[PDB]
């Protein structure tokens, strides 16, 4: 497997180069927001981001080695965490605001348009703020995002040998993160402290995903906005 033979620098470069582009929203400034039209915009955006995500995942070292079933399962588990960590990353330099798109920058009061969304906004805002205070670097961000992809569904799996392969790749991404922190000049103690802070943030991202999944499902069952067939099936994957 080509992935385990990568150097740390080669792991970073490949991840930086596989980054999806920042997409624009269908935001129309000629009309006011309603709950339905705000959700329409976000869902439409998310739907387009997903197609770029699927192709990004194919470029994450080790991901192609898995069977189609395992690939499907990992993306079904992580997709919303991955959209959220992107959003938080984009929003870093915009205190108090979430940059869904370059033409869609929203503060928490614009979140209140949608029943129950301001709570999610608040959590995303606080995470963006945490990344800002930590001075998260892009190289660290793409490692984290790749960790989410491989980790979030791995506990819900000779498919034990592929499960072992995923754990090997995760160890390489750990080595990569540490390599980056050392190269930035942090002491050894700062390295493993910083490593822990970043990974513990992944628990909060999981949390946000799970609360987000629950609100999207309730909106789907109230017909607030039409959902693409793809989004329906991804949402379906979390059903219980």
């Amino acid at each position: 497997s080509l992935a385990l033979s990568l150097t740390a620098d080669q792991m970073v470069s490949a991840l930086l180069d596989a980054e999806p582009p920042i997409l624009y929203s269908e935001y129309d400034p000629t009309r006011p927001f309603s709950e339905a039209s705000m959700m329409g915009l976000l869902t439409n955006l998310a739907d387009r981001e997903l197609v770029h995500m699927i192709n990004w995942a194919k470029r994450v070292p080790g991901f192609v080695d898995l069977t189609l079933h395992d690939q499907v399962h990992l993306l079904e588990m992580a997709w919303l965490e991955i959209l959220m960590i992107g959003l938080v990353w984009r929003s870093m330099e915009h205190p108090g605001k979430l940059l869904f798109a370059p033409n869609l920058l929203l503060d928490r009061n614009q979140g209140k348009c949608v029943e129950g969304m301001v709570e999610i906004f608040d959590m995303l805002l606080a995470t963006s703020s945490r990344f800002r205070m930590m001075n998260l670097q892009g190289e660290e961000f793409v490692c984290l995002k790749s960790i989410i992809l491989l980790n979030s569904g791995v506990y819900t799996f000779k498919s034990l040998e592929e499960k072992d392969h995923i754990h090997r790749v995760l160890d390489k991404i750990t080595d990569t993160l540490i390599h980056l922190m050392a190269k930035a000049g942090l002491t050894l103690q700062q390295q493993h402290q910083r490593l822990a802070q970043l990974l513990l943030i992944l628990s909060h991202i999981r949390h946000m995903s799970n609360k987000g999944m629950e609100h999207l499902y309730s909106m789907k069952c109230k017909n607030v906005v039409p959902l693409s067939d793809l989004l329906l099936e991804m949402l379906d994957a979390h059903r219980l």
Binding site: I54, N55, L68, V72, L75, D229, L230, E233
Partner: peptide, 10 residues
Amino acid sequence: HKILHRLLQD
């Protein structure tokens, strides 16, 4: 047969 499954092939 899932859309996701199809899209992962390209």
